[PDB]
Design a protein around this ligand. Structure first.
Ligand SMILES: *[C@@H]1O[C@H](CO)[C@@H](O)[C@H](O)[C@H]1O[C@H]1C[C@](C)(N)[C@H](O)[C@H](C)O1
Ligand SMILES: [Cl-]
Length: 7
């Protein structure tokens, strides 16, 4: 991924 979250 690379982005983060949290969803
Ligand atoms: C998400 O990124 C932050 C900042 O770099 C780290 O401090 C954190 O430890 C990291 O969270 C981990 C734990 C989690 C949420 N279970 C996932 O595995 C993520 C990808 O990594
Ligand atoms: Cl991500």
């Amino acid at each position: 991924x690379x982005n983060x979250x949290y969803x």
